[PDB]
Design a protein around this ligand. Structure first.
Ligand SMILES: Cc1cc(N2CCC[C@@H](C(=O)Nc3ccc4ccccc4c3)C2)n2ncnc2n1
Ligand SMILES: [Mg+2]
Ligand SMILES: [Zn+2]
Length: 341
């Protein structure tokens, strides 16, 4: 059993200091995808420790070690929605904690729930979207299509299935009320990763940013958690151009594979999932403009120290404009051949 040996070391070796992971590990400039995948479960532990969640919530170490490994094992390997995505999304949550003073805004348990949700938020993704589940009449659509957010409901349900696995319930010593709270938070935060949900609450997010965050307003806590979750989920776009480029490759590999399947089903894919129609620079500019930039502008409005995140996203969008000409074939292809006609 690979997991068992991995568990043994994770549990008995000690939790590595977060600075020992990387000297800039707690910086917005750090790219968590740089971390070797073999090191990420230990890094999860290091972040949990550094945020003092292990001590504060008296988390049983053997349970926590099993839990983190089970979460890791609960991701498949599509090009984008794999464990390294969830790891990088969790890392950003950690960055938010280390850089933005979330304790002035959120309860301890809410911040804890946010991190755990980040770990779990894409569990068992198959690299297809919600519409595909319905179109392909998948088991997940049979379960959840009547409620919407099919994949996100599945991710949440997988998170709970891991909790309910013997030896993996990191919350099983919580009071009944705290346990109920935690799972309720996990539901809300994971469902909030449906970008359809984000677009639906965006005006409320705007209004909250307009009037000003009210720590006494329970709906403000819920809205902020949604915004932070989305911010973690899209946080690849806040890194350097190179990350942005690689992430685009991964996302479109995944999209186009879905598109191939939709064509094999007799359905016409979304333009952005059709490898014969998708024009990636324009698609990425649209995504940055209509989705990512507004999110990090909201985040900046709420947290002035997040300004650099927004400006980096704006920058990456500018870079798509500048490299777009390169998608037009000038001269001959590099093989000197017009055979592709
Ligand atoms: C970090 C990151 C994450 C991410 N998505 C996360 C959410 C689900 C997926 C999704 O809806 N993509 C979308 C959504 C809306 C779009 C609108 C116009 C043009 C393209 C669009 C692509 C992919 N994308 N998408 C592209 N670059 C990304 N970078
Ligand atoms: Mg998701
Ligand atoms: Zn995600």
């Amino acid at each position: 059993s690979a997991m068992d040996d991995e568990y043994t070391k994770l549990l008995h070796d000690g939790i590595q200091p977060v600075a020992a992971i990387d000297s800039n590990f707690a910086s917005f400039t750090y790219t968590p995808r740089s971390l070797p995948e073999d090191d990420t479960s230990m890094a999860i532990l290091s972040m949990l420790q550094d945020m003092n969640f292990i001590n504060n919530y008296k988390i049983d170490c053997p349970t926590l070690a099993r839990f983190c490994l089970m979460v890791k094992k609960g991701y498949r390997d599509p090009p984008y929605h794999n464990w390294m995505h969830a790891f990088s999304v969790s890392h950003f949550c950690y960055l938010l904690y280390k850089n933005l003073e979330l304790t002035n805004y959120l309860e301890d348990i809410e911040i804890f729930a946010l991190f755990i949700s980040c770990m779990c938020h894409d569990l068992d993704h198959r690299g297809t979207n919600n519409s595909f589940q319905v179109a392909s009449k998948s088991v997940l659509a049979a379960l959840y299509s009547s409620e919407g957010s099919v994949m996100e409901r599945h991710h949440f349900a997988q998170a709970i299935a891991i909790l309910n696995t013997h030896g993996c319930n990191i919350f099983d010593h919580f009071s009944r009320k705290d346990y109920q709270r935690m799972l309720d938070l996990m539901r809300d935060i994971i469902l909030a990763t449906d970008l359809a949900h984000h677009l639906r609450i965006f005006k409320d997010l705007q209004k909250m940013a307009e009037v000003g965050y009210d720590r006494n307003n329970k709906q403000h806590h819920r809205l902020l958690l949604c915004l932070l979750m989305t911010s973690c989920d899209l946080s690849d776009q806040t890194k350097g151009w190179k990350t942005t480029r690689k992430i685009a490759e991964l996302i479109y590999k995944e999209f186009f594979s879905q598109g191939d399947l939709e064509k094999a089903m007799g359905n016409r894919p979304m333009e952005m999932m059709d490898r014969e129609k998708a024009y990636i620079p324009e698609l990425q500019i649209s995504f940055m403009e209509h989705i990512a930039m507004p999110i990090y502008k909201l985040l900046q409005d709420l947290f002035p120290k997040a300004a650099e995140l927004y400006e980096r996203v704006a920058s990456n969008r500018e870079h798509w404009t500048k490299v777009s000409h390169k998608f037009t074939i000038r001269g001959l292809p590099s093989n000197n051949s017009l055979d592709f006609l």
